[PDB]
Amino acid sequence: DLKSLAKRIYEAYLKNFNMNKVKARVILSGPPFVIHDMETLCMAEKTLVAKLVANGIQNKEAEVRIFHCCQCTSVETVTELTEFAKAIPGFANLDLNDQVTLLKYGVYEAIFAMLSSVMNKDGMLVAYGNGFITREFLKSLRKPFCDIMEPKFDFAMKFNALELDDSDISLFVAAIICCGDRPGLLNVGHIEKMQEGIVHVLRLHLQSNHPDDIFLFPKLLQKMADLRQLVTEHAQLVQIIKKTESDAALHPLLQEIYRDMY
């Protein structure tokens, strides 16, 4: 049954992501440590990422230290997304090379969708729910580092106005991953059929869970397209950083994901 597909996907999302929207809102309502300036950045580093500045790289610029912490977080999130993908019914029956391709193109769209759950108009919850970085602090970083997060806050504020819950977001992330128009897929037809099943369950679930919003499904299709564009632009900025910033070397896994992408 399609209700079973939706529940299995939701259960896989609750199991595999450390942060979910209910948990994040519980914390964001009221005690995470607030990073809003350089003084509090340095304090947070000593409490929450002690090893990073035990010596250490703390003679590198603050923007570069933040970027490193962000890379570590993305490496962790790719692992969580991979375990979630492996639990999406039918994903494990795909060609292993197609599974790689789907993850490669889908992870950052899924990341920026899920980032919305930890953002409000003032900032974002970070470090496994233990810190909160203000949106204004991130805007205050030197270029180009101040240009990374702001488009993601802009996406998140509109996405959050749709008032989705984790049961919806889990299906939306599954739809993002199981996308038959990624470049290089071997078995496009089998992936399109899998995608169709997930999208069908998403359409029915939104009708049930959001009876008040008759356009919520096409709104979410548009958000998927917006996320693809957001990822293309993000990758372009990452390339500017990798090229102009010597201390901003990419973790090998992230280099692999970005290579030959867009």
Binding site: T82, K86, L96, Q99, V100, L103, K104, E256
Partner: peptide, 10 residues
């Protein structure tokens, strides 16, 4: 054996 594929095989 890419790192992504390694994660899938974990």
């Amino acid at each position: 054996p890419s790192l992504l594929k390694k994660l899938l095989l974990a």
